Amino acid sequence: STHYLAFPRASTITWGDDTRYWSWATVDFCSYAIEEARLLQVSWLDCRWSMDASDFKQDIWYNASVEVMLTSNASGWNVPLHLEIELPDGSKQESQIVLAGRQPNVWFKIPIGKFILRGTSGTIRFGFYNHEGNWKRGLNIRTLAIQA
């Protein structure tokens, strides 16, 4: 079961307001108007949603997922995409995925890890990033999904 969807406008995306690096396109999602974040090109890819432990139930396993598409111009996905959940104590769930082997122009969902809240509140960060000196191009971001 899906408890929340968070759209990229709610994310902190480095360069997201820079038109030479990122685009925004309005589109319909099951009657709701959302904006997809479309990466043209960056060296510094960093996309981080912020929600609060208090937004969730305690002692329940949550999984997080981000739905993306590679464009026809997709490139530089040979480097590891770092996946992260940061809990309010600073502890993290850390992962890695290589996108170079994926087919373009189809939505797929990347899992970014599982968490549980024991002992209640504080920021919880949901992100992916790659900071290497190579160009990442042509990733479109639909939504963060949080399940339990």
Closest to 57 (Cα-Cα) out of 145, 120, 144: 120
CB atoms under 10 Å from CB of 69, counted, come to: 19
Under rule CB under 8 A, which residues in 82-101 are in contact with a second copy? none
Residue 47 binding Pt ion, by CB under 5 A = yes
Q: Given the complex with a second copy, which of 50 and 134 has the nearer CB atom?
A: 50
Q: Please, which residue, 18 or 55, has the CB nearer to a second copy?
A: 55
Which residue lies nearer to a second copy by CB, 60 or 98? 60
If we measure between CA atoms, which residue out of 63, 45, 50, 61 comes closest to residue 125?
50
Among 17, 19, 20, 32, binds a second copy (CB under 8 A): 32
Per-residue exposure over 48-62, b if at least 16 CB sit within 10 Å of its own CB, e if not:
ebebebeebeeeeeb
By CB under 8 A, residue 108 contacts a second copy:
no
Residue whose token pair is 């111009």: 73
User: Which residues of this protein are in contact with a second copy, per CB under 8 A?
Assistant: 1-7, 9-10, 26, 29-35, 50-52, 54-56, 67, 107, 121, 123, 145, 147-148
